[PDB]
Design a protein around this ligand. Sequence first.
Ligand code: BJS
Length: 223
Amino acid sequence: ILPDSVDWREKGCVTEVKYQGSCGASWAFSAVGALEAQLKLKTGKLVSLSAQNLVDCSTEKYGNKGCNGGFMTTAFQYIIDNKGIDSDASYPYKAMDQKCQYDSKYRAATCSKYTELPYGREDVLKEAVANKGPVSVGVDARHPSFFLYRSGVYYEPSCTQNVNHGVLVVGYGDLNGKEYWLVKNSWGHNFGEEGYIRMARNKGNHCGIASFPSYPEILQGGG
Ligand SMILES: C[C@H]1COCCN1CCCn1nc(-c2ccc(Cl)c(C#Cc3ccc(Cl)c(CNCc4ccccc4)c3)c2)c2c1CCN(C(=O)C(N)=O)C2
């Protein structure tokens, strides 16, 4: 059976909330967040990964445009191809497009593979959050109510399943019966609940939370 509630912050799998600023690189933050959890699960160490490394290096060849958008799946593919990603400390975030400055000397994580989940399947997303860890997702975050979100379970009747902002699902639960997905955003700690947004769960793919989910993996050999 799946636990009724999950919070990956309780297992020390979630780094501090980041502030993307005037750079449309939510995709890079969503991708690093998911891999940070895997790095902790596999080694026991929590280290922030370089979103800047994705912005500057996972570019045209990955269908990404740095500060003008991108995708978590192709960000994972770049990490696979590159044989690593630098730590955030070694390659810091500047909220702007720069020349690729990857340095294998400061590589903090690898990626073996990535898995995409079926569209709108909140049951499959719940299973992946429980058994695999934090899942990279897109959400419809265009509505004034998302921008004005302070606390509780976010429900927007005007929300669509067409995603426009990359976030990280780090858990799930319920607020006195109102089911939610625990979401890590990249708008700093002053957004919502210390940088988190709890979004309506099992409400017909509310805001397209389960439209395009993906998660990376770090494999330990094989048999
Ligand atoms: C095209 C091929 C080739 O190349 C690599 C892989 N690829 C993607 C294939 C799968 N696939 N994956 C996503 C997907 C997954 C995750 C995210 Cl995050 C986004 C996004 C976005 C986005 C869209 C518009 C804007 Cl303007 C912005 C910028 N942010 C604006 C903003 C809004 C609200 C608050 C703040 C900022 C981001 C999109 C989508 C799709 C299919 C079409 N999509 C939709 O039908 C939808 N839409 O569901 C979106």
